[PDB]
């Protein structure tokens, strides 16, 4: 039955809210070039300038490497998508009977493994593009946040929020546009067989989230190198400020959270956008929507998308125009705002879009059965894992936020050295995870029961229809970080680093809630699209009590762990080279230490692009080898308890490691603002209780910024790439159980 | 069918085996006593013996006030036991249809709610037994291990070596006897319904492990309060040798060793022999050796363990009379020795028991169906789980040892400080776990597709198979480590202390081995628990695509966190008034320092008191409850979705917490022996890079010694606890959906 909003309207629509968003988006980089600065106090303006563009050029130059690697690896593995699904039907080009309706004719499955292909491509080039773009305006806007904290903390959150709006409305709105544009070319060929049409668009998030993959990785080993070198000779060792720039580590410092926080944060969210939008709509193209080829309701995901983008720009005008900061007790409090006003909006444009675009009364593919679901229930999917979201965001602020006890005890407990400080703050981590679990527990159970996989899909990206905001608030953290590099390395006066201190703790904590939402949004659509590789590779039952599945769970339980030895030994080692070069430099180069003479800061920037250009390549093998190896040794059954053991266990280590990480920072953090008579009691800078919260900090480095954050993308990748490669499994895998 | 060994010859044959282990262990007891030494060179031997004195009181008094608590919960978890149970059948005194053959008439539910309540407190009773022994022996023979140490390592080796064995056989032979005894009493009111009869034997391992979980937990955050403390002001701020008399926590760190490491390890493994035992039992009592009433081959689980504890036997007299040794590098590998010949035995062992004791053919009950398995099939069961154990002994030595790259990495990264000895030794754990999931799942495969649970739990069991040794080379190492705690209190010779330390080293490595084997057999039994659980609940088949299952599984996998949480915040709390504490003392205390005035031992030893005590009560709490809070309120179902998680992801944490602590141990230790060029160029003892390890050591020491191996009994206890409850679930449970 057709929805009260025709289908013309919803081609229309769609377009029409991704311009809008990338309007708003464009203006708001504009109102940022308001900011001037050149290389060309006129001293600190220019010196701001020409660090800027000392960092820039070191984030545009390590993306250039990395991306040249990824996209090389990206065709390859096209490549290796056309073969392996060409192969199922011997490369025929003869039309077969739809499997969702005997009575119909579909294009054949050649056609879907080159259109995979294609959109496999799409999805990588557009997470390339989502990750260069944030480094972009991140790059151009951290100097300017610098000289904004000239005037106040609240003009420099101005300059970083509007421009980690730039960030957020770019992805969503690019995301969502190329995800229609895509929709409607392959359109053309499969005409009739939307079945084929959408599964063939799945590659999509395939490509999304195999580039992010690298991205997380290289990125996060790059600046975690960096960061943990930079620290402990300069902070520790040297009692010298943080970001001094007689340390030769400090410039691959700040051009790390470009290239980590920023672009692989970037890239990796999108993976997430995409994923969630394409298992939506896999499953709806065999469900009535796609039977009764009903284009609007088809299309619920994306027109639920193209709302959130007018949501949260109007969010956005909250925090931009009609509210100040005058103190820094603010920020934290107006960040968690654009996630409330956010939420509660979108609750309305949700009910909105639910009531126009969905008739009251449809089916829904259920393992076989088409379930009958009402509108009113799909409204509850996605606004489920909406209120999961907030509710994440609400729990992990709590955990990670110098605000809070559980942080203030965790700096508190440096008073006793590093290893309570380090006790306290694994401790915080593994009980961070129990509400975040129940929400997602929560969100499954009510969306599995309404919908089956389309509900959970569908509450996935419910999660994430607020996407822009979540970007913002979240890209506004590294441009903070930057700000405060910045200043220190133009010798600002000590009032501009303790307003960028300001809004860098509050990004410490946003950044937590960002890896929360990714993490929450990873476990829905991974379980939807897990529901989907069952139907699509026939398997009758997922029994957890048979051989093959159960040795399929524990060992994809087992995963997550192996990823991150990988990565946490990757940083470690790297680092510990960092160390070493920077302690070279400060005991061998006369007049460092006394400032008359100029690091080597290109050396410590080899070090961490040797490393990680290196280094990304085992955990991202790890990762989509795992699909290849299970699904054509041991079958799609043990494939399927491999995917099910990686979700649930990959998803506790993920969410300790990111805010015990976040603690151990903003413990630090506390201690260097000195904001309260207890966290006075801690310093001063250089205290043994300092040097103990750096300790934790520096451990937490890679846990929050290179394992942590990464496993969300473990999870959903293997996922769908299951997905994408379920009927060659199907029909040429289990090789060991065929042989014996 | 009946095998070539009669009914009557394994009636005398097991407990001829386990009178002659505990013959064999009070043999060595005896050899033990004649190292003599007595509070009434001469004051090296009385100091040594009055050291001993303070050491044994405060165990046996810190023992007592836990077990008082804990028998208290034991008594009213059995009062639940008995009415949950009976409230099946309506507390019915007539017999009702066999829940396995509803063509039979079996005893009364309630006679079996009464059975079950009396194996329950047998199984804690026997339990605190054998923690308190194991107390006894080791608490005696530390300051034997001390003045044999006198005359070189061979000796002070052997006494320890000899002490571990004497808790090894006596666990070993009375669990088997208390379990042989409990089945022939029971047998006379059941009769031919062998089902009730093992199903309320069951309750053996029940409370084995129960009681176990508070024990390992208690006399974890006891020992790890004290041991924090002590070597983090003594060693780190204050410049002292480890174990110094003038450091007041250096008493409560001793008593902790046997407290945690020895009572608590010994009550852990014997729930998990119990559970092994129990579950095969359960299985087969069902299977046609219960059915056909064929006494010899049902107790083929007790009859592998009766060989089990004559194969250690022999293998003990190779390390105690037929070898010696010279040289410390003889030490590890010594000890490795004994787990080699002890499997090579113990598979000939099997081998024989299976030709004997079992028909060639007959059936295994697996979900309804009565399966046809071969002896030889069998052999391959308990085989395979000896050898996946030898394997995991293996793989943890490589990772835990400072004879091999691993550790010695950890140990060299010190040079770059406390964060990057962190970082490695997080990546080190993550590490350690491929290798023994990947010999869990093989172990899996094989046991599941010959004989189904029972075959999983006959795995299980062949890994327990020879425990007497496993717990020999285990008890070995605090006995040890004491010993050289009281080398440094007594002031004796520097050449004692590195007799002891180099016999304390391998003891860590040998503690790791034992948690694999425990983390091993925890998951082979909860796994084989799960499916009997599955049958006893009547659930047709266990989806993980449902909603009920997989809420359960995702929330089930959180739980090993949450837990993990409490343990570590216990500690750290804990441990940093144990901090402030010493540093009072230090500081206040005048001669203290100076060594004049002695300082006030019982106030440290108050702190881990009160803090155990209180702190064991809420994981406890957490696990126990679980089944309970899970069953009633959402069912079986869900219980399912929550023990299949908590195993997988359980696993995981416990294997790297525990080998993580292992390394940052044993990195410390191979700096501080310096006994080799590499070792002695991150020395001397004070340095940066021996403080490092110092902090990666004393963080490590909760993660391996109270959250991570207490981390098996969180699994193997809520998996026989579901069990024993799955009726009254079945019956009385699920109740949030049977309302709304
Ligand atoms: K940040
Ligand atoms: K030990
Ligand atoms: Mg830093
Ligand atoms: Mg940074
Ligand atoms: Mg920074
Ligand atoms: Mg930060
Ligand atoms: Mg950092
Ligand atoms: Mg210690
Ligand atoms: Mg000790
Ligand atoms: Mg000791
Ligand atoms: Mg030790
Ligand atoms: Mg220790």
């Known amino acids: 039955g057709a929805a009260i909003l025709p289908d013309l309207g919803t081609e229309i ?27 060309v106090d006129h001293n600190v303006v220019v010196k701001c300038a020409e660090i800027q563009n000392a960092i820039s050029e070191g984030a545009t130059s390590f993306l250039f490497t990395e991306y040249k690697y990824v996209g090389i690896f990206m065709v390859a593995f096209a490549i290796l998508i056309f073969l392996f699904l060409g192969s199922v039907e011997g490369f025929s080009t003869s039309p077969q009977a739809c499997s969702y309706d005997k009575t119909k004719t579909c294009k054949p499955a050649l056609a879907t493994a080159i259109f995979s292909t294609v959109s496999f491509l799409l999805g990588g080039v557009t997470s390339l593009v989502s990750g260069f773009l944030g480094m972009k305006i991140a790059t151009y806007a951290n100097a300017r946040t610098t000289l904004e904290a000239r005037k106040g903390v609240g003009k420099a959150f101005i300059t970083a929020f509007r421009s980690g709006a730039v960030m957020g409305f770019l992805l969503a709105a690019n995301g969502l546009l190329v995800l229609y544009i895509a929709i409607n070319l392959f359109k053309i060929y499969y005409g009739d067989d939307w079945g084929g049409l959408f599964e063939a668009i799945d590659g999509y998030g395939l490509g999304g989230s195999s580039m992010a993959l690298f991205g997380r990785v290289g990125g996060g080993i790059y600046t975690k190198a960096a960061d943990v070198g930079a620290d402990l000779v300069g902070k520790v060792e040297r009692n010298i400020p943080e970001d001094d720039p007689r340390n030769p580590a400090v410039i691959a410092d700040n ?68 509210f100040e900061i005058k103190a820094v007790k603010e920020i934290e409090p107006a960040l968690k705002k654009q996630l409330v006003i956010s939420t509660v909006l979108m609750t309305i444009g949700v009910a909105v879009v639910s009531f126009v675009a969905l008739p009251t009364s449809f089916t829904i593919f259920n393992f076989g059965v088409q379930k009958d679901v009402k509108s009113w229930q799909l409204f509850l999917c996605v606004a489920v894992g909406l209120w999961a979201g907030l ?6 602020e709590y955990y990670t936020s110098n605000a809070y006890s559980p942080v203030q005890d965790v700096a508190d407990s440096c008073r006793t050295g ?108 991974s379980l939807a699209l897990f529901g989907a590789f069952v139907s699509r590779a026939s398997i009758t039952t997922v029994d957890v009590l048979t051989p093959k599945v159960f040795i399929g769970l524990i060992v994809g339980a087992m995963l ?57 390549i085992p955990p991202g093998a790890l990762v989509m080898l795992t699909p290849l190896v299970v699904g054509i040794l041991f079958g799609v059954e043990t494939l399927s308890g491999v995917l099910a053991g990686s979700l ?6 993920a969410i300790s490691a990111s805010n015990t990480g976040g603690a151990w920072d903003n413990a630090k953090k506390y201690i260097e603002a000195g904001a309260s008579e207890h966290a006075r009691s801690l310093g001063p800078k250089g205290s043994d209780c300092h040097k103990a919260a750096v300790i934790g900090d520096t451990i937490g480095d890679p846990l929050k910024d290179t394992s942590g954050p990464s496993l969300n993308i473990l999870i959903k990748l293997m996922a769908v790439e299951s997905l994408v490669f379920a009927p060659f499994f199907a029909t040429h895998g289990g090789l060991l159980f065929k042989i014996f």
Request: hydrophobic letters at 55%; a negative charge; aromatic letters at 8%.
């Open 560 to 616: 997550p762990y192996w990823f991150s030895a990988m990565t946490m030994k990757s940083v470690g080692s790297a680092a510990l080279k960092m160390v070493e070069e920077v302690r070279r430099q400060f005991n061998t180069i006369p007049g460092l230490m006394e400032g008359t003479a100029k690091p080597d800061y290109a050396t410590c920037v080899k070090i961490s692009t040797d490393a990680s250009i290196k280094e990304m």
């Open 255 to 322: 051009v790390g959270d470009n290239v980590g926080d920023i672009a692989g944060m970037g890239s990796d969210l999108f993976g997430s956008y995409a994923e969630s939008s394409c298992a939506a709509l896999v499953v709806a193209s065999i469900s009535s929507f796609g039977l009764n080829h009903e284009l609007t309701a088809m299309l619920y995901p994306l027109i639920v998308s193209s709302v959130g983008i007018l949501v949260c720009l109007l969010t956005t005008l909250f925090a931009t125009d009609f």
């Open 648 to 653: 649930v266990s990959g998803v506790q280590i």
């Open 13 to 39: 629509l769609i377009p029409v809210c991704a311009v809008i968003g990338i309007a708003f988006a464009l203006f708001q980089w504009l109102l940022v070039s308001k900011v001037k600065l050149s290389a």
């Open 391 to 396: 509710i994440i965001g609400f729990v992990t």
């Open 418 to 525: 590093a290893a309570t400080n380090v006790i306290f703050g694994l401790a915080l981590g593994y009980k961070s995870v129990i509400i975040p679990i129940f929400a997602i527990a929560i969100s499954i159970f009510v969306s599995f029961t309404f919908a089956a996989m389309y509900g959970i899909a569908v509450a996935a990206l419910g999660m994430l229809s607020t996407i822009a905001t979540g970007l913002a608030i979240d890209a506004y953290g590294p441009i903070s970080d930057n700000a405060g590099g910045i200043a220190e390395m133009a010798g600002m006066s000590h009032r501009i680093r303790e307003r960028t201190d300001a809004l860098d703790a509050a990004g410490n904590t946003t950044a937590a809630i960002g890896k929360g939402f990714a993490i929450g949004s990873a476990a829905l659509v």
